[PDB]
Amino acid sequence: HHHHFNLPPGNYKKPKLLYCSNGGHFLRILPDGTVDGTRDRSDQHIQLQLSAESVGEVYIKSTETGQYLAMDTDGLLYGSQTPNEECLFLERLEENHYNTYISKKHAEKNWFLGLKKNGSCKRGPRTHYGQKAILFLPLPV
């Protein structure tokens, strides 16, 4: 392992909203495959169904579109039509409270899922432990 194994409480029974502490945005996966954040709780593209691969491993899928959250070779997030290696994230507890999502594929590089205060997604290499951008709160929908 390149990372710790403190896991967050909770399960994957119901879909969730992934609320980013940084700018107060909900993670959004647009039908066009684009990824960002919105403060509009009413958005239809913020509903996500998480599931587990191995313990601590998850898929993050748009309920509206069926698209899987993924991070490309260049660290850019995108919506994938099919589940692939770029779609697996290491879900962990952080600061004894939040959830962090590390790219499994790019784990050794410490590339995280993250949102800027302006609601735009962060590129892998620009993320790092210790930022507010990587902190998420899963909220029920």
UniProtKB/Swiss-Prot annotation:
Predominantly expressed in kidney and brain. Detected at much lower levels in heart and skeletal muscle. The lineage of its organism: Eukaryota, Metazoa, Chordata, Craniata, Vertebrata. Changing K122R: No effect on LRRC59-binding. Changing S120A: Decrease in LRRC59-binding. GO terms for cellular component: cell cortex; cytoplasm; cytosol; extracellular matrix; extracellular region; extracellular space; nucleoplasm; nucleus. Plays an important role in the regulation of cell survival, cell division, angiogenesis, cell differentiation and cell migration. Functions as a potent mitogen in vitro. Acts as a ligand for FGFR1 and integrins. Binds to FGFR1 in the presence of heparin leading to FGFR1 dimerization and activation via sequential autophosphorylation on tyrosine residues which act as docking sites for interacting proteins, leading to the activation of several signaling cascades. Binds to integrin ITGAV:ITGB3. A motif (Nuclear localization signal) lies at residues 13-16. Heparin binds at N22. Changing S120E: Decrease in LRRC59-binding. Its main location: secreted. GO terms for biological process: activation of protein kinase B activity; anatomical structure morphogenesis; angiogenesis; branch elongation involved in ureteric bud branching; cellular response to heat; epithelial cell proliferation; fibroblast growth factor receptor signaling pathway; lung development. Monomer. Homodimer. Interacts with FGFR1, FGFR2, FGFR3 and FGFR4. Affinity between fibroblast growth factors (FGFs) and their receptors is increased by heparan sulfate glycosaminoglycans that function as coreceptors. Found in a complex with FGFBP1, FGF1 and FGF2. Interacts with FGFBP1. Part of a Cu(2+)-dependent multiprotein aggregate containing FGF1, S100A13 and SYT1. Interacts with SYT1. Interacts with S100A13. Interacts with LRRC59. Interacts with CSNKA, CSNKB and FIBP. While binding with LRRC59, CSNKA and FIBP seem mutually exclusive, CSNKB and FIBP may cooperatively interact with FGF1. It is found in: Secreted; Cytoplasm; Cytoplasm, Cell cortex; Cytoplasm, Cytosol. SUPFAM superfamilies: Cytokine. Changing K117E: Reduced integrin-binding. Defective in integrin-, heparin- and FGFR1-binding, and defective in inducing FGF1 signaling, cell proliferation and cell migration. Belongs to the heparin-binding growth factors family. Gene3D superfamilies: 2.80.10.50. This is Fibroblast growth factor 1. In the nucleus, phosphorylated by PKC/PRKCD. Keywords: Acetylation, Angiogenesis, Cytoplasm, Developmental protein, Differentiation, Growth factor, Heparin-binding, Mitogen, Nucleus, Phosphoprotein, Secreted. GO terms for molecular function: fibroblast growth factor receptor binding; growth factor activity; heparin binding; integrin binding; S100 protein binding.
